[PDB]
Amino acid sequence: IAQHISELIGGTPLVRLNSVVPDGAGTVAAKVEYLNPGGSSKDRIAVKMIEAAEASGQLKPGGTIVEPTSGNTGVGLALVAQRRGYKCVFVCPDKVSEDKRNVLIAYGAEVVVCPTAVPPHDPASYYSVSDRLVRDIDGAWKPDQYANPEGPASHYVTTGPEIWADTEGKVTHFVAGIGTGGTITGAGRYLKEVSGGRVRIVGADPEGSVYSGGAGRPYLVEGVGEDFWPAAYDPSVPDEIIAVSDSDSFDMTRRLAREEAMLVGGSCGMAVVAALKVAEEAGPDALIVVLLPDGGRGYMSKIFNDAWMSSYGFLRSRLDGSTEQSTVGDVLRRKSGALPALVHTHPSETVRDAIGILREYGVSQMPVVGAEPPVMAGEVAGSVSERELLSAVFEGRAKLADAVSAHMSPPLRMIGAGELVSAAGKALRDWDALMVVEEGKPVGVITRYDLLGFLSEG
Amino acid sequence: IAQHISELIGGTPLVRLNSVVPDGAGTVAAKVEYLNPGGSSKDRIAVKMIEAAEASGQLKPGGTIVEPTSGNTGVGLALVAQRRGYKCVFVCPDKVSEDKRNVLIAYGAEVVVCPTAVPPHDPASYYSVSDRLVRDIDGAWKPDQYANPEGPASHYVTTGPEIWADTEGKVTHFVAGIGTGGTITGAGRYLKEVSGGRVRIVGADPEGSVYSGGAGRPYLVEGVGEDFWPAAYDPSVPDEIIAVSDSDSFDMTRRLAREEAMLVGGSCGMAVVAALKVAEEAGPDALIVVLLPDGGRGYMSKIFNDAWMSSYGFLRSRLDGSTEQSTVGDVLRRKSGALPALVHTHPSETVRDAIGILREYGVSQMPVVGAEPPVMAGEVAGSVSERELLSAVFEGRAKLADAVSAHMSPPLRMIGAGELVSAAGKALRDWDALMVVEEGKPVGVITRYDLLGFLSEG
Amino acid sequence: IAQHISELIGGTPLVRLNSVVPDGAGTVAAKVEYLNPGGSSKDRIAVKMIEAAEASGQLKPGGTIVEPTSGNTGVGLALVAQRRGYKCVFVCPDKVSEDKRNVLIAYGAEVVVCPTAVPPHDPASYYSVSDRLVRDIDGAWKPDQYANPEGPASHYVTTGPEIWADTEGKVTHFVAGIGTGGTITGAGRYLKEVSGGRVRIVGADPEGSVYSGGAGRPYLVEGVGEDFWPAAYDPSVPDEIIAVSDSDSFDMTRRLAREEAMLVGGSCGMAVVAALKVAEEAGPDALIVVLLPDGGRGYMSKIFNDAWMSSYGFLRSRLDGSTEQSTVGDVLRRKSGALPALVHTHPSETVRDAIGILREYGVSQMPVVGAEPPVMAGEVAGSVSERELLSAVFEGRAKLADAVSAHMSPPLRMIGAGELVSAAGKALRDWDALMVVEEGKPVGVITRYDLLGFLSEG
Amino acid sequence: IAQHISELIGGTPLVRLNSVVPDGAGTVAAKVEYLNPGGSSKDRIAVKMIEAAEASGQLKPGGTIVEPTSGNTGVGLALVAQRRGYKCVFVCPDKVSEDKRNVLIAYGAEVVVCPTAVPPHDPASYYSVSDRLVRDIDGAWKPDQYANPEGPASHYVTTGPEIWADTEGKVTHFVAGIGTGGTITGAGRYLKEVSGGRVRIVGADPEGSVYSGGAGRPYLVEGVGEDFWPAAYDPSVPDEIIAVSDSDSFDMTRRLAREEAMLVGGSCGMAVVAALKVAEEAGPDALIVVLLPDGGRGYMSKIFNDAWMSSYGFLRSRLDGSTEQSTVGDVLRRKSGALPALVHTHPSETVRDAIGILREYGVSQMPVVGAEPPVMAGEVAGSVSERELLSAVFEGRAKLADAVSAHMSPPLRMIGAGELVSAAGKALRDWDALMVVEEGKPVGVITRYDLLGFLSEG
Ligand SMILES: *Cc1c(COP(=O)(O)O)cnc(C)c1O
Ligand SMILES: *Cc1c(COP(=O)(O)O)cnc(C)c1O
Ligand SMILES: *Cc1c(COP(=O)(O)O)cnc(C)c1O
Ligand SMILES: *Cc1c(COP(=O)(O)O)cnc(C)c1O
């Protein structure tokens, strides 16, 4: 009978992947690490760190833990400091969703939010505010997960021995996502100390990060990636930092959850792809132990959601099956399959009236058609674009009252209404917008803004 | 005691204008013609026309009058055919407002509406439908106010004699708006028959019409103007067709109502301006009798409304007084003086997120500013325009996930917030949109579309 | 050649009504008075009043005319003071529409608006503000159309003589709307002075006014009616104040415009109905000269509009023809003939969920039906009314989580969907709302609020 | 090195609760069961069931698994049938959220949704559709988790032995949530077979279910509860079914996650409360092993969300701290702290106009105040309620045109604007709505519907 829930942190199993790695390649054992009571791998470091603050006497009993959290370290820190009874207060960037910090609260942590995207060194970003809280509050102890030797030491104590024992001293490689830099350092250091120099440590890094040799970048895979060299990552340990893209990592995570029964996150997919790559230059008899460090339940609406995964130019395929059943006509069915009367103007109306219709119906383009009856057979006289009108009106090139026929641009190209949205993207790749001619007659205009707004919701 | 209300049609007074004509010029007598019981001058022709259908036996008792109406001829035709008891049915273009045809109904006329802007010779325009009604109904009699000699004959009988008698055979000129062509023909013909060739007939025509020698045009002044030669306008009568613009005619109508106590319409202002012009080449001792043919009560929301009169690039000044106490900041106060926190993005957000904010807030431009706190002192890093983004995203020049800082355009110019809207127009005459820096900090972006949308409502 | 437009004020014709008065009754001559250049009868008094201010020296040249206007007196005052050149400034209640005061401005009058419905004797109503303007401005002259003897004197001079001459001293009665009290006083006084006591003066008054013996009332017919005794109405003149209702006056105005070719207003209809009534107790050989004092062009959207005329429980019939073609189902077609899915709940859902659906869809009643498929054949289990739920929830009689089946009221009655809206009114006269069963299945619920909201727009 | 991820299902730890159980009571060991690879306890049964279909030859290789899922059994069934390679297809009620079935898909399961709340025995509910799928598809095998002996047998094999071994044959009681009825049956049967009759099995059941002796009820705690007797629950095993309410279970779950570092669900809280209750009649030396069967990550927005937890009359306190900082005035700040103003009417306006304002502003009550200036000092003349008006208007008791002062109800009571929302609830408990008098003047009316709409969002 365990004494607290934070005593079961460790000894996580070591299962193997048998359907993602190709045939004729070494063994890939994925050290599933989302079975910890805290949900992620960060629990390991958490425990160790707290222990230090009790041995070094640097965290007097009843003191408060202050920390600029990421979302996973907070979970473990709360889960443990709640056993000891230390009040915990985080300072989180508003970039974190409501569910994540709601969990962070449910564990008994006080989360004070501050704006984001501001420079880290100014009073707005959460680093300076965390320092200010450290000053004001008494008995504060900023664990500083980025420059804390205990971080990597904890993995050196209780992540290498598991890797070395579950395989019986037979592990050719050890690939692991390198984020803030504790898992690879504290694990590879021990794997090398206990195997001479046999097991070559490899570290996967999101494409275009500091470790991978590139410059900064906006990062999507939560966890891995950095813009500076953490004080707790000795760059001498890893032997090959194999960088991997973002689309590849997300697709690998999805395919892993679908073909191996593991709900791993983004960094997990990145690590698995880095492995499956390194597992080629190591022929048969190779044993690559990847470190899947998260559980893919928090991302359930972030990378398993075809909508989000499609907004960021991603989503090779859909989770359930067939690819693109929706056709361009459905882009027009925002009113529940209710293609409204083709907002149209005639070669005799007034430029002011054309601008009026454009403003009143929200649309930004309209085919001037020679018959108010919306039944024209592809013989629309021209096209009027609100931008072009406003330009010709504010540059004296067209009086407000002038007839529209003297300032209308050439007609805009046409695409069928029963054609797939991928074809619509391919087409709009070259023009600004185009009218959908549904069995002879036009029924509206699909435009870049509208297509890219539809992709991001359905 | 008159027998019917349609017996008082005629003998309308002849008042003179004494504040619009400059000093040192002849006398200008304006034959106010909106005192007829039917409201306009068309009553004259109406009566005559009906009489013909009773003498020529071409309108059997109990028959129906069918006519593609304009709005004034309908009033007189109803007012008279209601005395005789003839059912009247009009076919009106939807271009006519609700008040006009509502009046046309209140007199007991049946108005059947058809779409407009369609060619006159097709089954959609009201000419063909009027002919179809003439066929179907029995005893129909299409008066055809455009090719009816009785039209001009009525003015020859009861509009020249009034002009010739109220002035005692002393009239140098007779200027009159020339629309469908009865008032000038039937009046000048008599003025010449009874004065040899002394009184030189002049006819005003809206700028760019058939009579003025130009080609077709979208017409705003209701009444005057045409696109073809009516069969009832003998072009030999008028001696000088002095064409006048639209802004000039509207301004003259407004100034006439303000400085002469006459609520005349648009054609009235056109005729008065044509007079005031011809009254220069006729030195002292000239007596120009203009024919103001309408009453400016129907246009009360069409040319006396600063909003409408400003949408069509018009409105030199406002009715009441000072010019432009508008200011550009008020363009931002669409939420009741509630500047909207300035939608912005930062040099680190994702292109997808910038497009997201643009779509979500409706705005089409946004300043990328290096601090989420909306307090920047004119040091915004750049500007992002939804069009430019969507272009760089659908042309492969920018991944959806790429940082915005790599695809942001140069900053957009600035204008004060306490500056008049005329200055805003002068500025936007050269750029696409500009941010209003209100005492150091920016508070939004005013754009061509927004300014031209505000002018048309306030 | 008149010298100014305000010289033609007077001598308005005297036409007779020959289709509204029944058979076997005296002659009814309606002194049409909307042919004055200013549009209404008030011009008469206006002229006279101004003359006084010039003879009595009480209005020094260049002085300003201040007046709490009604809408017609302003027109005449502007039309004349613009001839003299006196700056005119009105103070109008916000109850006046935009078109009326827009006209009042177009004539060159400065209209300063103040809130309405406030007591007349306080600084908010326009009487006190008019007095304040009289104090501040110099040379001000508040004509005070309510306590000015010149008002009735003007009609005594130039409205009785016309009535007495156009009929050749043969007029049995003279009925005229009695509003502020000048037309009846100044006309009947002369008719009696010049006919001994023969011509019995009659005065029509809106039902429930001071003159008719009743108490105050909210007045709709613009003009006639008062809440106090004006200082310029000698109650000894009129011999019978025959009060008339509002619906009767509006219907008489409409029928007059349709069967006599006169666009008279509301007071005109009231006067005509009062006449047609008095013309019964005066057998053959009676000559009743009604005084139609307004022109029905300003009300074109106030009493000739079936929408407005129907909101105030009016509108016996429609202007054009057949009565009530719209059927109850069209009340549901607010989404363009798009029945809204029939928001429903089931006997197992939670009271919280029922309140949720009610709030989310705006509706206030919903039939609990035993099958989510909206195809039930009139076997809906019950009805839930948001009010009843909220009551049973805030009075502890139903937990938020309790099943709805324990707090649902009896079903609400049903009416067909192809039945006329008049039937719907007759039905809702007894219940709170009822579901429209369209050929077996229900398709929604029409409610008092919805029906009375539809009547007021279509 | 495990062979598949579904080999680690079992041997879940047995941690003890040391802060929720009061002092002077036996030991409470909570067999945390959310550490299974599939997330919940259902994995156990899942494995066993699949094994049967392979030994009994009742699931031919390549066959499809059809099952009307709940949300947890689906996870385990997918996780295992994906190891064997059996296509899995679920039929889920639309009551399940998007995240749950999205997870269910990510594992490679085909989820076909059908409407809910329909009777289970009809073709609309998912039972009949599941049977239809069993018929159509080939090799189908409906596991039927409700009438499958293997269900309870699996817990008999691998849930009792763990309970009996982790405690060394020393367990006085075994309390466990009783839902579909496998955990208590298959565990208590073994605990009794191996301990004579010592360990008294107890089973917690949501208040008002079949097992607890009550009738049906709408159930909120996902999992536990039933409306019929499952064919796989032998009611002879449990010795005391201690029923527990819903609010109690949710509060216990929240307090457990906050004071024991366990994110358990709803059934977990119910089981823990049932334990903490039974642990009173068992003095010192008692060892109650509760069975927490779920992980509280899916409910993160269902019971840890103060909004949802407050809509269903719940939420004793908030997760973070102080109770009700929001005051009634904030209920009015739906427009971002911008009380619209104070829609009002005056004792002279028309009933039609009062109904008009009510309809136009959405509000359902309005104080008739004797001064349009919204500055009245608590001297509002009356109150008008749209319902009352519409009633008095459709029952002939008030003409549309009648003055409002004759049909206005007594004023509605007042409450301060800086008072807490709990006070507002206490007040509205007795009236229909009340106006908030903010430092003397009124600033609006808060109504039951508005308060209960605000509670459900903030
Ligand atoms: C913490 C974390 C990692 C590993 O970070 P380290 O650099 O090893 O400390 C990987 N993925 C995710 C999602 C993480 O949160
Ligand atoms: C009819 C009309 C005229 C005169 O038209 P004619 O060509 O003389 O028949 C001028 N102005 C308006 C507004 C008219 O309606
Ligand atoms: C002024 C007016 C009257 C007549 O008012 P008096 O009391 O005669 O001065 C009648 N109807 C209307 C619409 C009016 O404006
Ligand atoms: C399955 C389940 C249980 C236990 O159900 P049994 O009746 O033991 O089969 C308890 N809680 C939840 C949330 C469950 O899903």
Side-chain angles (χ1 to χ4, degrees), chain B residues 212-225:
Chain B
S212 176
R217 180 198 83 170
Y219 297 127
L220 299 179
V221 292
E222 283 152 19
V224 308

Side-chain angles (χ1 to χ4, degrees), chain D residues 4-30:
Chain D
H4 185 75
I5 181 52
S6 84
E7 300 299 359
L8 320 166
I9 301 180
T12 54
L14 232 124
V15 57
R16 74 171 298 186
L17 323 179
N18 44 8
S19 184
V20 304
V21 57
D23 213 320
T27 298
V28 185

Side-chain angles (χ1 to χ4, degrees), chain D residues 40-42 45 70-73 145 155 176-185 211 221-226 230 233 265-268 270 291-295 299:
Chain D
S40 70
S41 175
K42 285 325 217 294
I45 77 170
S70 175
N72 270 327
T73 315
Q145 54 162 349
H155 287 271
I178 179 60
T180 204
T183 246
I184 226 215
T185 281
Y211 312 148
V221 292
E222 282 152 19
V224 308
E226 280 305 344
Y233 160 64
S267 54
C268 314
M270 189 182 62
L291 180 49
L292 311 176
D294 254 1
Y299 321 103

